[PDB]
Amino acid sequence: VPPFNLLPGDVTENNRWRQWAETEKPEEEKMPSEWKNLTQFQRLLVLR
Amino acid sequence: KERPVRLTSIVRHDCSKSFANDVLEMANVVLDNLPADRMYKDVATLLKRQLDETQKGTWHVIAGSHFGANVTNDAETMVNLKIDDMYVLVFRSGPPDR
Amino acid sequence: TDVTYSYSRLRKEFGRMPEFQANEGEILVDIAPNRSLKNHYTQLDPCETVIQNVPSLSESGTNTERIQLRHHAQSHSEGGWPHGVDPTEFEEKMKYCRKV
Amino acid sequence: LELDSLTHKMDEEAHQLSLPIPDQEKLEDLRVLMNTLQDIRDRESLVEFQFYPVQQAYALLQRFNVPIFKEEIDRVEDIRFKWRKLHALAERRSDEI
Amino acid sequence: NSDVIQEEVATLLRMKFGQEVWNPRKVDSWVDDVVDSVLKNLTDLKKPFKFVVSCVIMQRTGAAISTGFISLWDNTFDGVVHVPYENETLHCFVTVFFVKLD
Amino acid sequence: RKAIIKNADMPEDMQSDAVEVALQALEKFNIEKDIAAYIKKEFDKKYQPTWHCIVGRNFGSYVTHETHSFLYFYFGQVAILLFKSG
Amino acid sequence: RKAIIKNADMPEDMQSDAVEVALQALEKFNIEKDIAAYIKKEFDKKYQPTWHCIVGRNFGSYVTHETHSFLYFYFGQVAILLFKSG
Amino acid sequence: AIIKNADMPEDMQSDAVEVALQALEKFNIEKDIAAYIKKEFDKKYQPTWHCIVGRNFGSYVTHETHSFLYFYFGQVAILLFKSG
Amino acid sequence: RPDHKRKFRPNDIRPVVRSLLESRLENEVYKADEMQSISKEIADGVRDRIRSMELERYKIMVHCMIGEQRGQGLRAGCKMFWDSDTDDYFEEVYVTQHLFAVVTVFGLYQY
Amino acid sequence: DRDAVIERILKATDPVVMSTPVYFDYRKDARTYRFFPSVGQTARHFSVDGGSVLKDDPEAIQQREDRQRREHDTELAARAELNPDLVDKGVSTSILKNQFNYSDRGSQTMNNAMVERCVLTDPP
């Protein structure tokens, strides 16, 4: 997806992402603003 | 129900003074018909609907307390009403022939 | 940046009786109207308007008079001595002792 | 109650407007499409005033740490984005009609 | 003598109104300009006189106008002068009353 | 420069143009009527008449428009509304 | 009752009316809070209300305000402020 | 702290406390400190807010909700209400 | 410094001027001689009302322009040479279907 | 006392202009209130906009020709609608803006209700 090239957009208003970062056990909840359309492998990369 | 004392004035106009007065009492009628908790969107809707009923073609209405306008207006159709805390502007758009 | 013309007068000159005189005006007749210039002109097909309903605002300030505050120091360990004598050092108090 | 009422009502409304139109359609849904699109328009001007109190409701809930399931909090954020896809859908449907 | 006075004010009016056409966006420019110019002239005067000046600018569409003015002063020392200006596009009128100080 | 725009029936190139022209209008002018004059004259000169603008801190609208030529948004404590009609 | 009023930018008939109203307010009420309340209620009832009133002995106040809608004056040692703000 | 009147969020109570303390720390003139408060507070959260400084006085103001605050430090009193 | 009990106050004169002008100039028709006559009557009547309200140690001048309006622009401005503490001035313009009239009332204090 | 020398100054400023208005300069770096650079002491008394432009104005001629073009397009679309084959032949129709070429907009600016509150300054 293009927002892999557009991470700075989420950096501009990076709210739900650091909500996710604050949340514990961070692979049992995915931030919902269309980044839910990501497979397990890409989720593994972003979690790393 | 008798109308209470409302501070009413009309100062901006290129239209006929009779039309300006008519716009005044139709605005008063709309305000009377409205319920207690007035809402400016509903004011605009009912005012424009009544204007379109009583007059051919298309008009446009803005109403509030803090704004400022720049439009292309049809001649002698450009009205500002002052009713208590109401700044009311109505203007006209040229229709095609039918 | 304004006109600042000033003229001087004496205090006793302000008591003069005000002067008023009866007069009439005048008029000159010119510039008769013509329909031809109106025929050359025309009214404006749909016009432009600017409308503002922002009431005019400004800034201001209100103060109150204040009690001014300063500072001063004092000490005493030499006791009460006459005003003309400074007990800072020795010879002045010695000659005051010969006086007393 | 308020939440799932509005959410599900929008859900079936989006589902019923998601119906397709193939080539050389018949002459039956012409009345229906106009009314549906105008209903979307008519509520669009007023939705944000009813999105206004729903956020403060859950704010007042969490401010005294009431137990709430996590998925519902996820929904109410998404409803802000859920209304977004309908607007572009509305305009493309308008162009094609 | 008011002859010299109407001389410079007529020169002023022709030089700041002899090269333009009526345009509503920018008439206030000449308004302020002639205000400042005649104020500078009155300042250069330093006479013991009180000055009342009215300047009006009119759009020429065949409209008629009259120059009625009334006096309530002593004509021995006080005076009045009026100067018009006209072209094919606009009009202007200046009236000045000067009253010797008490 | 942080604008949350939720009202539009007009394409994205024109909405970006409207955002940019609003920014430079705020940068150049000082009064709301001057800002509205600049915006309206710009669109009327550059995409032909007829357009209309309203700027405000408290107002309510009900206006007939023309398709694919409409925009409205909230910028801080101000609101901007543009529409072509004619 | 004597008073000193030289801070105003607003018509003199209404400054006279405001000063008079403050006179009867001081006469009726001894608490500055109720004095301010009475001045506010009367002046807001009679003219267009988004007015604001401050009583004080030694304080600091200043405001952005509607033009021709500001007043500040004194009764001996007490100060009174009235301004439009809406 | 001595904070008994409020129509604020907690963060607004906070940053109001710091801005008032820092103004008091810098300056002693009522105009100067109230100037710092009004202009800086407007800088951060938009027109139109108003603050009042005084050791003893009386005032009665109008505001929307979550737009009013009243507090003390030592012998200075601060109003902070929105209007316009 | 002039006494306050006889100082010039326009807040009562201006409503009187407005009411009287709208009472008598409501439905006039065009003819140059009668605009001249009614303008002279305007000057006379306004100064009669002023001298009836009876200023003391004040000189009042009334200046009146007349024109015909057909939807065209006009730029009205005035200036004097005077002192802010005593002297005063005010304006009033009426516009009807046939014409427009501008009146200026200027009040000066005699030292 | 009666022999005192007294000077008087005459001026051209406007006491009606006795307050300096401000505007909110909305600069990204400023967020300021700013006074106007100057308020002209030359008073403004009466104003009319005016509604007369001579027929030889090129802009007026252009807009007049635009009006003839608009009405010509109006009857073009009228007879094109009346005879549907003309639309195939190449006559425009959307110029006749119907209920399906028009739509209504309407919006509200959000605001919050005002309330009244009082505070008291306790003695030290």
XYZ file of N, CA and C in Angstrom, chain E:
306
model
N -6.445 89.147 -0.752
C -7.168 88.924 -1.998
C -7.424 87.437 -2.215
N -8.681 87.093 -2.489
C -9.044 85.711 -2.761
C -8.799 85.309 -4.208
N -8.438 86.259 -5.077
C -8.142 85.913 -6.462
C -6.937 84.992 -6.558
N -5.853 85.328 -5.859
C -4.689 84.452 -5.846
C -5.041 83.109 -5.217
N -5.899 83.120 -4.189
C -6.259 81.894 -3.480
C -6.985 80.930 -4.409
N -8.019 81.420 -5.099
C -8.699 80.567 -6.063
C -7.775 80.206 -7.216
N -6.755 81.029 -7.475
C -5.757 80.646 -8.467
C -5.029 79.365 -8.063
N -4.474 79.304 -6.838
C -3.711 78.081 -6.567
C -4.650 76.898 -6.387
N -5.853 77.118 -5.845
C -6.724 75.960 -5.654
C -7.228 75.442 -7.000
N -7.412 76.332 -7.981
C -7.794 75.883 -9.313
C -6.650 75.139 -9.987
N -5.412 75.611 -9.799
C -4.270 74.859 -10.314
C -4.206 73.479 -9.680
N -4.418 73.414 -8.364
C -4.422 72.146 -7.642
C -5.469 71.196 -8.208
N -6.695 71.694 -8.387
C -7.767 70.844 -8.891
C -7.479 70.359 -10.304
N -6.987 71.237 -11.185
C -6.739 70.770 -12.546
C -5.564 69.798 -12.601
N -4.534 69.996 -11.771
C -3.386 69.099 -11.862
C -3.663 67.746 -11.216
N -4.480 67.693 -10.163
C -4.860 66.392 -9.622
C -6.191 65.862 -10.139
N -6.802 66.484 -11.147
C -7.988 65.902 -11.763
C -8.017 66.036 -13.281
N -6.885 66.307 -13.919
C -6.885 66.467 -15.356
C -6.421 65.280 -16.173
N -6.160 64.121 -15.558
C -5.560 63.022 -16.306
C -6.156 61.663 -15.950
N -7.391 61.619 -15.453
C -7.977 60.340 -15.078
C -9.441 60.284 -15.495
N -10.042 59.117 -15.260
C -11.447 58.834 -15.517
C -12.042 58.327 -14.209
N -13.362 58.456 -14.067
C -14.037 58.001 -12.858
C -13.815 56.508 -12.639
N -13.441 56.145 -11.413
C -13.204 54.753 -11.052
C -13.447 54.574 -9.558
N -14.497 53.844 -9.168
C -14.902 53.820 -7.750
C -13.874 53.224 -6.805
N -12.947 52.401 -7.297
C -12.008 51.723 -6.412
C -10.963 52.659 -5.818
N -10.755 53.836 -6.410
C -9.577 54.633 -6.091
C -9.826 56.141 -6.041
N -11.079 56.583 -5.896
C -11.354 58.013 -5.750
C -10.842 58.534 -4.412
N -10.917 57.710 -3.362
C -10.428 58.111 -2.048
C -8.957 58.500 -2.076
N -8.197 57.988 -3.046
C -6.821 58.433 -3.230
C -6.760 59.932 -3.495
N -7.521 60.414 -4.484
C -7.527 61.853 -4.733
C -8.176 62.613 -3.595
N -9.169 62.007 -2.939
C -9.758 62.626 -1.752
C -8.664 62.980 -0.755
N -7.915 61.967 -0.318
C -6.859 62.177 0.668
C -5.773 63.102 0.134
N -5.457 62.998 -1.160
C -4.402 63.827 -1.729
C -4.767 65.306 -1.682
N -5.978 65.656 -2.125
C -6.371 67.060 -2.109
C -6.568 67.549 -0.679
N -7.036 66.677 0.225
C -7.107 67.042 1.639
C -5.733 67.434 2.162
N -4.731 66.586 1.927
C -3.388 66.872 2.421
C -2.808 68.118 1.764
N -3.055 68.300 0.466
C -2.499 69.449 -0.242
C -3.080 70.759 0.279
N -4.407 70.841 0.395
C -4.991 72.096 0.858
C -4.725 72.300 2.346
N -4.589 71.220 3.125
C -4.163 71.377 4.513
C -2.757 71.956 4.595
N -1.849 71.483 3.739
C -0.497 72.030 3.717
C -0.508 73.497 3.313
N -1.356 73.860 2.350
C -1.471 75.263 1.960
C -1.988 76.117 3.116
N -3.034 75.646 3.798
C -3.600 76.409 4.904
C -2.594 76.536 6.040
N -1.785 75.496 6.253
C -0.700 75.574 7.225
C 0.353 76.588 6.795
N 0.679 76.627 5.505
C 1.644 77.610 5.025
C 1.117 79.030 5.181
N -0.207 79.194 5.242
C -0.773 80.536 5.376
C -0.371 81.209 6.688
N -0.550 80.527 7.828
C -0.333 81.117 9.157
C -1.130 82.398 9.391
N -2.243 82.574 8.696
C -3.077 83.743 8.906
C -3.937 83.565 10.155
N -4.343 84.667 10.797
C -5.267 84.571 11.943
C -6.712 84.357 11.500
N -6.942 83.255 10.789
C -8.238 82.968 10.201
C -8.640 81.530 10.494
N -9.943 81.333 10.663
C -10.556 80.025 10.829
C -11.097 79.575 9.481
N -10.803 78.331 9.119
C -11.047 77.808 7.784
C -12.090 76.704 7.846
N -13.070 76.766 6.948
C -14.069 75.715 6.780
C -14.072 75.346 5.304
N -13.658 74.125 4.987
C -13.534 73.680 3.605
C -14.395 72.443 3.400
N -15.197 72.458 2.340
C -15.983 71.297 1.947
C -15.644 70.940 0.510
N -15.205 69.702 0.302
C -14.873 69.188 -1.018
C -15.742 67.974 -1.307
N -16.355 67.957 -2.485
C -17.261 66.888 -2.879
C -16.901 66.441 -4.289
N -16.973 65.132 -4.525
C -16.672 64.535 -5.820
C -17.912 63.798 -6.302
N -18.272 64.017 -7.564
C -19.527 63.554 -8.128
C -19.249 62.797 -9.418
N -20.045 61.765 -9.675
C -19.954 61.025 -10.926
C -20.849 61.683 -11.968
N -20.293 61.936 -13.151
C -21.008 62.645 -14.209
C -21.828 61.654 -15.027
N -23.147 61.677 -14.831
C -24.096 60.942 -15.659
C -25.240 61.850 -16.092
N -24.946 63.132 -16.302
C -25.973 64.112 -16.586
C -26.684 64.657 -15.369
N -26.213 64.332 -14.167
C -26.876 64.778 -12.950
C -26.667 66.271 -12.742
N -27.728 66.961 -12.340
C -27.660 68.385 -12.057
C -27.295 68.619 -10.598
N -26.819 69.830 -10.314
C -26.373 70.186 -8.975
C -26.431 71.700 -8.851
N -26.599 72.180 -7.621
C -26.613 73.604 -7.329
C -25.615 73.900 -6.218
N -25.147 75.145 -6.186
C -24.087 75.536 -5.265
C -24.573 76.547 -4.236
N -25.768 76.329 -3.694
C -26.289 77.219 -2.670
C -25.503 77.116 -1.370
N -25.012 78.264 -0.910
C -24.331 78.362 0.372
C -24.802 79.628 1.068
N -24.796 79.602 2.398
C -25.332 80.705 3.184
C -24.228 81.242 4.086
N -24.281 82.546 4.352
C -23.293 83.232 5.170
C -23.933 83.763 6.446
N -23.180 83.685 7.543
C -23.561 84.297 8.814
C -22.345 84.936 9.472
N -21.532 85.631 8.681
C -20.298 86.236 9.157
C -20.279 87.720 8.815
N -19.216 88.390 9.250
C -18.993 89.791 8.919
C -18.168 89.865 7.641
N -18.765 90.413 6.580
C -18.109 90.457 5.278
C -16.948 91.441 5.225
N -16.762 92.265 6.260
C -15.644 93.203 6.273
C -14.307 92.473 6.271
N -14.198 91.392 7.041
C -12.973 90.609 7.114
C -13.141 89.159 6.694
N -14.335 88.591 6.831
C -14.548 87.194 6.489
C -14.954 87.068 5.023
N -14.792 85.863 4.479
C -15.049 85.683 3.063
C -15.322 84.246 2.677
N -15.772 84.095 1.430
C -16.152 82.811 0.855
C -15.613 82.720 -0.568
N -15.161 81.523 -0.939
C -14.755 81.244 -2.312
C -15.242 79.849 -2.679
N -15.685 79.692 -3.924
C -16.105 78.390 -4.422
C -15.489 78.153 -5.789
N -14.954 76.950 -5.991
C -14.331 76.569 -7.248
C -14.920 75.243 -7.712
N -15.498 75.175 -8.902
C -15.891 73.883 -9.466
C -14.817 73.311 -10.376
N -14.932 72.026 -10.693
C -14.118 71.392 -11.715
C -14.978 70.355 -12.416
N -14.847 70.276 -13.737
C -15.647 69.348 -14.517
C -14.832 68.800 -15.677
N -15.189 67.590 -16.093
C -14.664 66.972 -17.301
C -15.811 66.218 -17.963
N -15.483 65.351 -18.914
C -16.510 64.530 -19.535
C -16.906 63.334 -18.681
N -16.211 63.085 -17.569
C -16.406 61.865 -16.800
C -16.823 62.081 -15.353
N -16.527 63.232 -14.756
C -16.780 63.419 -13.333
C -16.907 64.906 -13.033
N -17.097 65.210 -11.750
C -17.247 66.577 -11.274
C -16.653 66.685 -9.877
N -16.280 67.905 -9.504
C -15.786 68.171 -8.163
C -16.141 69.598 -7.786
N -16.385 69.813 -6.499
C -16.738 71.134 -6.006
C -16.003 71.391 -4.701
N -15.421 72.583 -4.576
C -14.724 72.985 -3.362
C -15.290 74.321 -2.909
N -15.648 74.413 -1.632
C -16.054 75.680 -1.042
C -15.236 75.938 0.216
N -14.807 77.187 0.383
C -13.954 77.596 1.490
C -14.547 78.850 2.118
N -14.692 78.829 3.438
C -15.105 79.977 4.229
C -13.971 80.314 5.184
N -13.520 81.564 5.170
C -12.491 81.994 6.109
C -13.036 83.128 6.963
N -12.842 83.014 8.274
C -13.359 83.974 9.242
C -12.201 84.492 10.081
N -12.030 85.811 10.118
C -10.963 86.395 10.920
C -11.205 86.120 12.399
N -10.133 85.797 13.122
C -10.262 85.439 14.528
C -10.711 86.634 15.360
N -11.384 86.334 16.467
C -11.918 87.361 17.353
C -10.802 88.162 18.014
